[PDB]
Amino acid sequence: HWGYGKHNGPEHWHKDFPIAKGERQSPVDIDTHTAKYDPSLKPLSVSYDQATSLRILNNGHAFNVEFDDSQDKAVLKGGPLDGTYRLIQFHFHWGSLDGQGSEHTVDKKKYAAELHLVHWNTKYGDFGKAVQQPDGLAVLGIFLKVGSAKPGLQKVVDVLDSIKTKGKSADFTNFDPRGLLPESLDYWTYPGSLTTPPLLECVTWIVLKEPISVSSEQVLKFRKLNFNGEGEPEELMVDNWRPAQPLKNRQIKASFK
Numbered sequence: 001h002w003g004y005g006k007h008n009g010p011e012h013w014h015k016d017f018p019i020a021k022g023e024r025q026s027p028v029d030i031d032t033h034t035a036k037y038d039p040s041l042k043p044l045s046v047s048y049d050q051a052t053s054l055r056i057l058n059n060g061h062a063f064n065v066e067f068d069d070s071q072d073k074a075v076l077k078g079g080p081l082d083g084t085y086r087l088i089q090f091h092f093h094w095g096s097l098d099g100q101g102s103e104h105t106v107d108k109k110k111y112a113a114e115l116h117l118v119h120w121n122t123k124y125g126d127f128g129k130a131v132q133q134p135d136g137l138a139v140l141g142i143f144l145k146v147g148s149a150k151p152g153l154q155k156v157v158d159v160l161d162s163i164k165t166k167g168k169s170a171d172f173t174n175f176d177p178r179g180l181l182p183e184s185l186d187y188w189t190y191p192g193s194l195t196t197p198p199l200l201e202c203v204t205w206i207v208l209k210e211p212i213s214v215s216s217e218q219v220l221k222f223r224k225l226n227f228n229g230e231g232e233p234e235e236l237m238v239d240n241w242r243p244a245q246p247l248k249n250r251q252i253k254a255s256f257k
């Protein structure tokens with residue numbers, strides 16, 4: 001099956017997922033000079049006060065922090081979006097070294113990691129129906145740079161020892177995702193896709209301009225996770241990012257002047 005190694009990584013995905021060569025694939029390089037400020041874009045409305053985290057799972061590709069998406073608790077609205085998108089999970093992509101790891105790039109700059117908060121459009125009723133639509137998902141992307149520690153990330157870091165290998169999960173209740181945001185909600189937006197198989201073209205991407213800082217020790221602990229299952233040869237979970245894809249017939253819009 002698919003992965004991020006030389007024999008199953010991004011250059012191979014198109015064989016089982018031909019949409020990998022589609023017209024609105026993600027991630028992309030954000031050329032800051034040619035992104036055009038759109039004064040009609042609204043401020044992002046991030047309403048996470050009632051978020052109910054449930055569990056953290058090593059899925060063999062990253063770790064997902066999962067939320068209760070049965071009801072309208074944590075939602076994303078505004079910005080480029082029409083209607084209401086419910087938070088279902090977040091996860092990260094990161095590198096083996098601080099100089100790589102993000103999926104989106106900014107003027108070709110790679111960040112050490114990238115956080116994806118995944119939301120589905122409530123008009124479609126369930127996540128599974130949302131991923132059959134071109135406006136089914138909204139992913140809020142946040143870059144991570146290495147510097148000072150992010151206090152709101154430490155609870156995530158300190159559970160990773162308990163989900164080292166593929167298929168392991170742990171309770172992860174009462175986690176507040178507001179602690180992962182930067183100060184500013186200024187963003188770029190464009191239409192794209194999931195960045196892993198099945199690579200479905202359902203995503204309104206909202207990528208925040210301002211990175212969050214995390215410490216070297218925090219990202220080092222991400223890199224101690226394993227892609228493999230328990231009892232299998234150890235393969236460190238690093239470099240679980242897809243490179244930038246062709247922009248094709250798309251424009252990236254900026255929320256800020």
Ligand SMILES: CCCCCCc1ccc(S(N)(=O)=O)cc1
Binds near residue numbers: 118195
């Ligand atoms: C038919 C089931 C599809 C599950 C898709 C799960 C998924 C969610 C978000 C992302 S990402 N990295 O674009 O945020 C990738 C994959």
Ligand code: NA
Binds near residue numbers: 034035036251252
């Ligand atoms: Na442009």
Ligand code: NA
Binds near residue numbers: 070071
């Ligand atoms: Na419920």
Ligand SMILES: [Zn+2]
Binds near residue numbers: 093116195
């Ligand atoms: Zn992702």
